[PDB]
Amino acid sequence: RSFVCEVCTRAFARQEALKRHYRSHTNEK
Numbered sequence: 001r002s003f004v005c006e007v008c009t010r011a012f013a014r015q016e017a018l019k020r021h022y023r024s025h026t027n028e029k
């Protein structure tokens with residue numbers, strides 16, 4: 001397992017870093 005962005009694939013060591021990332025795939029300059 002791992003914290004990878006299914007959208008793009010960007011992996012993050014910190015989950016929060018991911019969730020926050022996924023926000024960019026929606027609305028988060």
Ligand SMILES: [Zn+2]
Pocket residue numbers: 005006007008009010021022025
């Ligand atoms: Zn992504």
